[PDB]
Design an enzyme around this catalytic site. Structure first.
Site, PDB file in Angstrom:
ATOM      1  N   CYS A  32       0.808  -1.212   0.000  1.00  0.00           N
ATOM      2  CA  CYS A  32       0.000   0.000   0.000  1.00  0.00           C
ATOM      3  C   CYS A  32       0.858   1.287   0.000  1.00  0.00           C
ATOM      4  CB  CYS A  32      -0.908  -0.054   1.215  1.00  0.00           C
ATOM      5  SG  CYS A  32      -2.062   1.331   1.297  1.00  0.00           S
ATOM      6  N   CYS A  35       1.459   3.648   2.819  1.00  0.00           N
ATOM      7  CA  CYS A  35       2.177   2.935   3.857  1.00  0.00           C
ATOM      8  C   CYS A  35       3.685   3.016   3.626  1.00  0.00           C
ATOM      9  CB  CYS A  35       1.724   1.484   3.934  1.00  0.00           C
ATOM     10  SG  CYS A  35       0.063   1.297   4.640  1.00  0.00           S
TER      11      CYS A  35
END
Length: 105
Positions: A32, A35
């Protein structure tokens, strides 16, 4: 220096063991993008604040804790003090992360 949490039991041991220190929890996934963006920053904070406990939960590996903690977006940051969730937000927001640590460290 960030503690990687790999079960619910581990999550619960970490919260107890923090005493009355702020606990910052990054619910994250390797794939992600936001992230990946915030992860260096999050590690660096871990160094900056030795009085604050930094945990990371991989939601792909730790689906039970993700469910229990009502995660729907990543990264999500939850903030605990005396087992209580005193804060929460999602997004790679460095200002909010540091604002919340400032409030409860």
């Amino acid at each position: 220096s960030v503690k990687l949490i790999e079960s619910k039991e581990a999550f619960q041991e970490a919260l107890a063991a923090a005493g009355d220190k702020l606990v910052v929890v990054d619910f994250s996934a390797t794939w992600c993008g936001p992230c990946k963006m915030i992860k260096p920053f999050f590690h660096s904070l871990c160094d900056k604040y030795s009085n604050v406990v930094f945990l990371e939960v991989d939601v792909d590996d730790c689906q039970d804790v993700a469910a229990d903690c009502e995660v729907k977006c990543m990264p999500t940051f939850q903030f605990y003090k005396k087992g209580q969730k005193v804060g929460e937000f999602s997004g790679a927001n460095k200002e909010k992360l540091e604002a919340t640590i400032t409030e409860f460290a």
